[PDB]
Structures are given as structure tokens and as C-alpha cells.
Design a protein around this nucleic acid. Structure first.
Ligand code: SFG
Ligand code: SFG
Lengths: 239, 249
RNA sequence: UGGGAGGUCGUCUAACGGUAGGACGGCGGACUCUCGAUCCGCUGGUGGAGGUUCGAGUCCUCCCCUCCCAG
């Protein structure tokens, strides 16, 4: 099985950033992931290929023009066939987190609408969009980076391609040399005992989650081992 | 004129064309309002195999970035940037980015962004070369390039002259700490839905109040937590109260 | 529907008793853009009757509608 992602964007070339590079790029070459794009501009019918328009009530800025965007969405929705969910990238949507990523991952086909300018017509959101998703509480100039972020995150779940895995931040990592700028690698990682290492790393993940993002610890049911190790870390932090 | 410089450390510098050749950010670059320079650790690898990943102690998942190429790239960039440059590591273990953080980061004249790949980077490079760690969200990506581009884009909207003449009236979410109001454009009736008459009224004061009320109502219904510590005018309190009543009962 | 005040394009704002303008909106067009930028046309008004005056947005009367002050 593979993942198919439809994208509606005025700047499809931006998507090369994920399709021609890294793990996701490798995913594309092996046909494990396909990303098809439709450009509202290819759907205009005028001399200047207009894809934006003025918002009613005046004031500055522009919105994406309704017709080209709509036609692109219907065309993409068509090509996608039955069962394809249309998602609009927006700061007012559901904030992405690992749970949202896994849910989005269930879907076999998705179509991602990338806004530009001041956004899209509200009626298109009500009539064509199934779900709105935000990548964070901040505003960007467009939805392409958010779309690629979502794609990359879900792409990690495609067969043949873990922090947050258990609700915890990842542990610290080390590689050669044994000593770097007077800093030595914790002896336990070189001890070669898989069990001592596993326990040390788990304790570190727990300590970091507690110290940097302690709130990520309310919704979890720690195992006896996790509760014990966390208890130890808190004792070490301020004795 | 207004200018900002962003140094980037990345194995895939070409990814950055996504924010430098396109849109508002592309024009900002084309007008020298925003400058992005990229150093690639692969160009600093002694390894004859242009190898940039090394094995993690303890065995485990994946590979880590090789220390020497990454370190040399960071020192070269830091040296080129000169003094006063803040070094940031993109990582999910970092401070979660939000609009307040974007304004704060936007307070820097020079920044260097380190983009990880594979399982990440040696913790000691973080302790010795990194000033701050930032995450774009509670989810895991294959690399720091998208997060870096996200950070750059987010701060770029705040560089004067980027959006154009009087961007102070340009409306986006979080700009004033509230979510944006809904927007409408031509045609007047599509898929049975009509544009709210007030926006066609030409009545300026009512439109200002409508927009403000919509922003308050939408923020209240979708992200009420933002409303927890917000300085508000008498008018916003009144308008918000009207909206809360209107939906309830 | 008691006592005050007031009516000009859709909105805001001008005009001595002398040919009713401007800004924004709305419609449409140029930039030759990826311009969330900037320009340019077109649309459109004195609430209604009387009366004074050579002439009324302006002054007088009545009618209507609107705001403020206690139903
Ligand atoms: N936090 C975000 N998450 C996902 N997409 C975003 C985010 N911020 C901006 N975008 C995209 O950027 C496009 C252009 C934005 N300037 C529009 C913002 C819109 N006016 C709002 O505040 O809701 C939006 O249509 C979205 O597609
Ligand atoms: N949410 C995020 N915010 C910022 N950077 C991220 C995010 N997710 C992944 N990255 C970066 O992209 C790469 C992700 C992977 N290397 C895995 C990282 C590993 N889980 C860690 O704990 O660092 C690293 O460079 C991360 O710093």
C-alpha cells in the first residue's frame, strides 16, 4: 500500500521541497508516495490569469478568487474518486499534534487546499471543506509549508520508510567521538548492556518531558517502570 | 531600508527555494528585504564518500548526523554572520512556536537555523553551539528544513514593507491575538450562500464593529484560552458579550 | 407613543440664499505581478408637500423619518 496526496496550490513547485529531497523524496522515487498538484491558475479564463479578488466591505488585501480555486478542487476531488477527504490548511483549524497526525494517516487519499493572501471565501470553507487544520498558533503567508508539514508528518507512517511515540519527548543522542569539546558520552551508552541502556534512555525521555513540557504528562498512564524512573529523575533534579 | 539575514545549516539547501523564489517571501528576497544563505554540511565532509551520518552510541533507531561536517558548517556560518548572531536548533523538544514567540524571534537582526536530519544531532553540539531550541509543533518531521522555512515565513510577515503599503490594516489570525473574521469575495450568491449584507452596505462603522465581533466570537468559540489574558477595550467586552449571548440560549 | 435635537450619494464629509464636490463602498478597467502594493474610469445624494425670494441643500409652515432626555 502507498499514500496519495492531492494538493491545490498556486505554487506547486514549492512541493518539490518534499518530493525531490530526503526520506520523502526517496519515498516518491519508489512510488510509495504520490503527490499530485492542481494550480488554480490553470483554471482561469482571462488575459491576466487572475487568481485573486477583493474582499467585500473594502479594506486592504486580497482573497483567492472563488471560481479557479473551486474548479481546481472539483477537478482534484474528481481525480481522487470516492472517499477523498478535503482538508483546508488554516490557522483557525484543528491544531496538529501526534494524535491528529495518526488520524490523518488513516485516510488513504487526502486533498490539501493551500491558502494565500488573506485566505479563501468563507462559503467555500462551509461547502467544500471537510476539515480545517492548523500547524500552530502563528500566521504564515501561505498554506504550502503547512501542507508539506502535514504530508511529511503523515508520510512517516507509510510502510517501508520514536519521539511522541509514548507521549514523551525523545531522549538525548550521541555519536562519535567519545569526547567532543570536553564533553564525554554517558558511560551507560557504551556499556553494551541493552537493558541498562533502555532504562537510562527511558528515564531521560521522562525527565525531559517533565522539565520542558510537563503538561504532556496529564493524559498518560505511566507503567510501573515509567513511574519509578520519573520518580528517580525528579529526586535527582532537586535534592 | 529594512533588511533581515537568516543563515541556514542544511543538507538540502535547495528546499529553501520554496520560500525564496515564491510568493510574498520570494518578493521580499528579490527586494533585499529578506536574505537567506545556506551552508551544506556535505560540503564540509572529509569523508571521501561525502558521508554525513554517523552511528548512535547505544545502538537503536536510525543514524545521527555526523558531528564534524555539521560542526564545521555551523562554525563557518557563525563566523560569516559575525557577532550578535543567535543560533537556533529546530527540534520537537524545543519551545513550541506561537505568535508571541514569532515577535520575539523577529527581534533578532541575524539568526542561524540548524536543521537536523535522521534521528537528530549529538546533544553536545546542542549544549556547545546552540542558543535556543524551537519546535513548530507537537509532531515529528523527517527534517528541520520545513520547520526552518516555517519560522522564516512567520517572521517575514512582520518585516516592514513585506506585505506592502499599510499592512497594519491587513488582517490575519493572532495578529492582534484574536482569530481572524470570515472573509467574502465575488460572486454574491454561490452554492446557495449569500454574503452578509453589512459587508455590502458601504456602512463603514458597522463593518468595523462586525469584523471585530466576528473575530471575538470566533476566538471565543474555537480558541477561548487565547482570551484568558487579553487586554480588551470596553467595546470588545460589549461586542463579545453580545456574541456569547447570541449563540447561547 | 411627554420634553429637547436633527435630516445631503450606501457610508463619512463638504457647498455665502447662486451650476451639489471629495473620500470610502459597489460595478468595470489598467498595471503587464506571485505585486495581500499602486493607479484609472463608471455608479450614486439634498426625506415630502407648500411658501418666501430674481433664485432654496440652506430661510418660513406643515407632514414624515431619525437621535438624545424617564414612559
Ligand atoms: N497556522 C497555520 N496553519 C495552517 N495554515 C496556515 C497557517 N497560517 C497561515 N496558513 C495558510 O496561509 C494562508 C494565507 C494566510 N495569510 C491567510 C490567513 C487567514 N486570513 C486567517 O488568519 O485565517 C491561509 O489561507 C492558510 O492556508
Ligand atoms: N516539530 C518539529 N519542530 C521543529 N523541528 C522538528 C520538528 N520535528 C522534527 N524536527 C526536526 O527534523 C528532524 C526530525 C528527526 N531528525 C527526528 C528528531 C528526533 N525525534 C529528535 O528528538 O530530535 C530533526 O532535525 C528535528 O529537529
Amino acid at each position: 500500500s502507498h499514500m496519495w496526496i492531492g494538493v491545490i496550490s498556486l505554487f506547486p513547485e514549492m512541493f518539490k521541497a518534499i518530493t525531490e529531497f530526503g526520506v520523502t523524496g526517496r519515498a516518491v522515487k519508489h512510488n510509495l508516495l504520490k503527490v499530485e498538484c492542481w494550480n488554480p491558475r490553470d483554471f482561469t479564463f482571462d488575459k491576466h490569469k487572475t487568481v485573486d479578488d477583493r474582499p467585500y466591505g473594502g479594506g486592504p488585501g486580497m482573497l483567492m478568487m472563488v471560481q479557479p480555486l473551486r474548479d481546481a478542487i472539483h477537478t482534484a476531488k474528481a481525480a481522487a474518486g470516492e472517499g477523498a477527504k478535503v482538508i483546508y490548511l488554516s490557522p483557525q483549524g484543528r491544531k496538529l499534534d501526534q494524535g491528529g497526525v495518526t488520524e490523518l494517516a488513516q485516510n488513504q487519499k487526502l486533498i490539501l487546499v493551500c491558502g494565500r493572501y488573506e485566505g479563501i471565501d468563507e462559503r467555500l470553507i462551509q461547502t467544500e471543506i471537510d476539515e480545517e487544520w492548523s500547524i500552530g498558533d502563528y500566521v504564515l503567508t501561505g498554506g504550502e509549508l503547512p501542507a508539506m508539514t502535514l504530508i511529511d508528518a503523515v508520510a512517516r507512517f507509510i510502510p517501508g520508510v520514536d519521539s511522541f511515540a509514548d507521549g514523551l519527548l525523545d531522549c538525548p543522542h550521541y555519536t562519535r567521538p567519545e569526547v567532543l569539546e570536553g564533553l564525554t558520552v554517558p558511560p551507560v551508552l557504551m556499556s553494551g548492556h541493552h537493558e541498562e541502556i533502555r532504562k537510562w534512555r527511558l528515564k531521560q525521555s521522562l525527565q525531559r518531558t517533565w522539565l520542558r513540557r510537563p503538561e504532556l504528562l496529564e493524559g498518560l498512564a505511566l507503567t510501573d517502570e515509567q513511574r519509578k524512573l520519573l520518580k528517580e529523575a525528579q529526586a535527582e533534579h532537586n535534592s
